[PDB]
């Protein structure tokens, strides 16, 4: 099972609800540390597969597999050893693994997640080794309203707070982006001494985030002095 999509969408959330609903052991690891050093390069693959097998029926979930099965896994032999061990483990073929293919000791699904599915090798996404592909996309308008409500529950929002009128300002946002938006709204409401979070607080937070994009980091006094620096004839042209 191959999980793909934009980062911060919660693929490990799907893995954990899979573990909770199945009621089975769930081996969870990360793929960044599998090309660690010369002490044990490809031995960790064998160990984690064997740990899954000894408690089968179980699952194995490795995060950000792109550091192991990437397009540069064949140039470097150190990556190649781990990749070959990974390819050997996901099959049966009793020789070099020493176990029967069809038994209770093989009921293990290899779960992998990544952010760029086009960077993976063709032989890993080849059928038989990876059977299902799931692309988890970014949420939508109503989902973003629900995410804002979830991540902004334990804060003193004022009576003018409504995220339904600020959905279009958050197109492409994930849950982490909305959580950071809520946190920055709390910070900015504290900044002016306001007790609650106003709609103007979130509006000014989004406006500050937008103005910081083009390289304008100016306070109010500098902005006003710079606006007064220009003349009036060359301002009406921009106004028109």
């Amino acid at each position: 099972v191959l999980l793909s999509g934009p980062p911060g969408t919660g693929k490990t959330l799907f893995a954990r609800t899979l573990a909770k609903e199945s009621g089975l052991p769930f081996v969870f690891a990360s793929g960044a540390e599998f090309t660690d050093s010369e002490k044990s390069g490809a031995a960790k693959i064998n160990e984690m597969f064997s740990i899954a097998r000894r408690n089968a029926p179980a699952f194995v979930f490795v995060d950000e597999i792109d550091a192991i099965a990437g397009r540069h896994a064949r140039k470097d032999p150190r990556r190649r050893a781990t990749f070959e061990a990974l390819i050997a483990q996901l099959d049966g073929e009793k020789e070099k693994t020493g176990i029967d293919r069809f038994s209770l000791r093989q009921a293990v699904i290899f779960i992998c997640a990544t952010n760029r599915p086009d960077e993976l090798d063709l032989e890993f996404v080849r059928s038989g080794r990876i059977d299902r592909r799931l692309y988890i996309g970014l949420p939508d308008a109503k989902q973003r309203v629900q995410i804002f409500g979830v991540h902004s529950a334990g804060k003193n929002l004022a009576e003018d707070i409504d995220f339904g009128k600020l959905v279009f300002r958050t197109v492409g946002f994930s849950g982490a982006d909305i959580r950071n938006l809520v946190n920055e709204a709390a910070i900015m409401s504290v900044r002016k001494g306001r007790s609650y979070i106003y709609q103007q607080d979130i509006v000014d937070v989004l406006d500050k985030q937008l103005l910081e994009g083009m390289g304008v980091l100016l306070t109010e006094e500098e902005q006003q002095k710079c606006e007064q620096s220009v003349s009036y004839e060359k301002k009406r042209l921009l106004a028109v």
Partner: peptide, 15 residues
């Protein structure tokens, strides 16, 4: 490609 092996140490430290 990190032929000299310094990149491997850099990546190990980074991770």
């Amino acid at each position: 490609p990190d032929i000299g092996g310094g990149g491997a140490e850099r990546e190990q430290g980074l991770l």
